[PDB]
Amino acid sequence: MKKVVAVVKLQLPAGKATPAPPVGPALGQHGANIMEFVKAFNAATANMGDAIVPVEITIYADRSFTFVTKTPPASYLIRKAAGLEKGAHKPGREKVGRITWEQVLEIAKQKMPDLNTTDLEAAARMIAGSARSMGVEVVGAPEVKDA
Amino acid sequence: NASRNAWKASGGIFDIPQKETRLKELERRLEDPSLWNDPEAARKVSQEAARLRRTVDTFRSLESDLQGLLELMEELPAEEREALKPELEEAAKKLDELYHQTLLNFPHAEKNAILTIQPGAGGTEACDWAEMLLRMYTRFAERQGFQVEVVDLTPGPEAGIDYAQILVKGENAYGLLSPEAGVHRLVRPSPFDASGRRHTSFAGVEVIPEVDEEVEVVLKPEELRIDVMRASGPGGPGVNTTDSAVRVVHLPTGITVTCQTTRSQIKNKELALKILKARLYELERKKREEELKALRGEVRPIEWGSQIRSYVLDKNYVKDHRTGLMRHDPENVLDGDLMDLIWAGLEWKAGRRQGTEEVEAE
RNA sequence: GCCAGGAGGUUGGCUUAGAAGCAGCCAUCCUUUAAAGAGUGCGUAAUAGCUCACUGGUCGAGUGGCGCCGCGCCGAAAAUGA
Numbered sequence: 040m041k042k043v044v045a046v047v048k049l050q051l052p053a054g055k056a057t058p059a060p061p062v063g064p065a066l067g068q069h070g071a072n073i074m075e076f077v078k079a080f081n082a083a084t085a086n087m088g089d090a091i092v093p094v095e096i097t098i099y100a101d102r103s104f105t106f107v108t109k110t111p112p113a114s115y116l117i118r119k120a121a122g123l124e125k126g127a128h129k130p131g132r133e134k135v136g137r138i139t140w141e142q143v144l145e146i147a148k149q150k151m152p153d154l155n156t157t158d159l160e161a162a163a164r165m166i167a168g169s170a171r172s173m174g175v176e177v178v179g180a181p182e183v184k185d186a
Numbered sequence: 187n188a189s190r191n192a193w194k195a196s197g198g199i200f201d202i203p204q205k206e207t208r209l210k211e212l213e214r215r216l217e218d219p220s221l222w223n224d225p226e227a228a229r230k231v232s233q234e235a236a237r238l239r240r241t242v243d244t245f246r247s248l249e250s251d252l253q254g255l256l257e258l259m260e261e262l263p264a265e266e267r268e269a270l271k272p273e274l275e276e277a278a279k280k281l282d283e284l285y286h287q288t289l290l291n292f293p294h295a296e297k298n299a300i301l302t303i304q305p306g307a308g309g310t311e312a313c314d315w316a317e318m319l320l321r322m323y324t325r326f327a328e329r330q331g332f333q334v335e336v337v338d339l340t341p342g343p344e345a346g347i348d349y350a351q352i353l354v355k356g357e358n359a360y361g362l363l364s365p366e367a368g369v370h371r372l373v374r375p376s377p378f379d380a381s382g383r384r385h386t387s388f389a390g391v392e393v394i395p396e397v398d399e400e401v402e403v404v405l406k407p408e409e410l411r412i413d414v415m416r417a418s419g420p421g422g423p424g425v426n427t428t429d430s431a432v433r434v435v436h437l438p439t440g441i442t443v444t445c446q447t448t449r450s451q452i453k454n455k456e457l458a459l460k461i462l463k464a465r466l467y468e469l470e471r472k473k474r475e476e477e478l479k480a481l482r483g484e485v486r487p488i489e490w491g492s493q494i495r496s497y498v499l500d501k502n503y504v505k506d507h508r509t510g511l512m513r514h515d516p517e518n519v520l521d522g523d524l525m526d527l528i529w530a531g532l533e534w535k536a537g538r539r540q541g542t543e544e545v546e547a548e
Numbered sequence: 549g550c551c552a553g554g555a556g557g558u559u560g561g562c563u564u565a566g567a568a569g570c571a572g573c574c575a576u577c578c579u580u581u582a583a584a585g586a587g588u589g590c591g592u593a594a595u596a597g598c599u600c601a602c603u604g605g606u607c608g609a610g611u612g613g614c615g616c617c618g619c620g621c622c623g624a625a626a627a628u629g630a
């Protein structure tokens with residue numbers, strides 16, 4: 040059995056937290072006790088560092104929530120080899136970085152279990168793709184080969 | 187540099203307790219669902235949240251460079267103590283941002299500025315003092331990194347200036363010279379006085395950026411109504427049966443005008459319009475005055491006591507009567523040392539009297 | 549036309565108080581798979597909600613777009629009675 044009245048998508052660092060918006064109106068118009076509900080948030084952020092961990096929320100009818108922490112956006116991978124905190128204003132002409140075909144492969148392993156996409160071969164095009172439209176183009180070597 | 191620390195540090199400290207209580211009354215207002223329903227009324231609400239960024243950032247940056255810096259530095263030649271000095275070299279870099287983000291918030295602080303000097307109470311020595319102030323702000327510009335052009339200047343009978351005006355180029359030209367408003371006071375034995383006793387002399391100063399124009403856009407066809415009617419006076423049957431007179435009233439401004447000096451309707455309709463143009467230009471120049479002259483100063487007697495900062499060369503001491511601040515070098519200040527004044531105290535009290543007026547009752 | 553899904557990473561990068569396919573700027577991944585476009589319109593403060601696009605079923609015979617020609621429709625209110 041289960042119950043849900045209205046879902047929502049929120050984000051926050053993996054440890055720190057503040058009641059201010061956009062998280063503000065969220066835990067205020069649906070109820071969310073920081074006396075016990077947040078203690079389920081610090082348990083999965085004590086050993087783990089900090090990141091763009093987007094909690095894929097799922098509010099119930101009884102004001103409660105589902106603290107199932109999901110993986111960070113595929114854009115969190117590009118600003119990991121580079122270190123940027125933004126992105127190009129025009130994905131196509133200019134270029135804010137040049138993460139090689141290898142960077143896209145190593146940290147992308149973290150994204151497969153949460154995603155519904157198949158093996159690491161399939162989880163490879165998605166991350167490079169989430170870079171084709173954020174001002175950057177990869178560089179590789181093995182590639183096609185073919186007959 | 188330990189003399190300006192507590193000045194800039196405590197400068198961002200008095201905003202802590204005040205904004206702390208206010209942002210709390212707002213952040214809890216952003217919760218209830220019934221609040222956002224108000225259209226643009228709710229924008230003014232979430233707006234104050236956009237200020238909890240330019241306040242909490244100092245609560246973290248200024249507080250960290252005060253807890254860590256003040257620790258390891260109390261005594262040591264150059265080992266681990268002088269090594270902690272470069273650690274806060276960016277503390278002077280970040281000091282620039284907190285200072286800037288409280289000056290540009292003026293009306294037109296970012297753009298250039300015009301500064302007119304004119305002598306006052308103090309006889310011909312006052313007429314001589316004005317040139318001193320001109321030569322003060324002039325050097326203060328180059329050394330600030332500004333460019334200067336004397337828009338106008340007129341030498342006095344024996345002194346050196348009955349009037350002068352100088353346009354300072356560069357960003358924040360209006361920002362820095364803002365607190366330079368009002369009449370300054372000079373004290374010294376008069377070089378023109380035979381007995382040479384100690385006389386006082388004054389001089390006013392003013393600052394203002396720049397504007398533009400709009401002559402033809404006013405005479406939009408949609409605004410004024412044009413009337414036709416037979417003419418008074420001679421003509422024959424032609425005058426009786428042919429209306430050539432014209433009445434071009436400006437609907438909004440109400441100002442009307444009539445013409446009929448020529449036999450033609452078009453040449454009257456034409457003249458009556460060139461006439462309305464002249465009057466509407468003289469009506470726009472009157473209103474162009476309050477919004478380009480009230481900015482100068484709501485008073486400024488230039489008399490005695492109308493001053494805001496005295497420069498005594500006898501005992502060698504300037505003194506800003508606004509901040510109560512004092513000093514001991516009138517000889518150098520009247521050469522370019524305005525930075526020490528404008529920076530810490532001047533812009534402060536200048537924005538203070540208006541920054542305490544809005545955050546309380548106005 | 550009607551029954552059902554219409555999604556996942558994704559909440560696209562950036563601008564911005566907010567821009568969650570939906571003010572604007574720049575744009576050219578994959579996958580559960582039969583199919584669903586980093587998105588047609590509405591709905592929002594930002595979302596959820598509705599729909600097309602597309603695929604499945606049913607039905608059971610035609611249907612949709614574009615160019616050309618003929619005649620016609622609107623555009624079309626006045627002062628003595630038509």
Ligand SMILES: [Mg+2]
Nearest residue numbers: 046047048596
């Ligand atoms: Mg949802």
Ligand SMILES: [Mg+2]
Nearest residue numbers: 406407408409
């Ligand atoms: Mg109009």
Ligand SMILES: [Mg+2]
Nearest residue numbers: 417418419444
């Ligand atoms: Mg008359």
Ligand SMILES: [Mg+2]
Nearest residue numbers: 419420421422
């Ligand atoms: Mg005659």
Ligand SMILES: [Mg+2]
Nearest residue numbers: 420421422423
């Ligand atoms: Mg006649």
Ligand SMILES: [Mg+2]
Nearest residue numbers: 424427428429
């Ligand atoms: Mg006639």
Ligand SMILES: [Mg+2]
Nearest residue numbers: 426427428429
């Ligand atoms: Mg006639």
Ligand SMILES: [Mg+2]
Nearest residue numbers: 549550551606
């Ligand atoms: Mg049916």
Ligand SMILES: [Mg+2]
Nearest residue numbers: 551552553554
């Ligand atoms: Mg359906």
Ligand SMILES: [Mg+2]
Nearest residue numbers: 550551552599
């Ligand atoms: Mg349906």
Ligand SMILES: [Mg+2]
Nearest residue numbers: 553554555584
């Ligand atoms: Mg489906």
Ligand SMILES: [Mg+2]
Nearest residue numbers: 554583584602
């Ligand atoms: Mg579908």
Ligand SMILES: [Mg+2]
Nearest residue numbers: 553554598599
């Ligand atoms: Mg549906």
Ligand SMILES: [Mg+2]
Nearest residue numbers: 168169170577
């Ligand atoms: Mg992509």
Ligand SMILES: [Mg+2]
Nearest residue numbers: 558569586587
């Ligand atoms: Mg998509």
Ligand SMILES: [Mg+2]
Nearest residue numbers: 568569596597
């Ligand atoms: Mg949706």
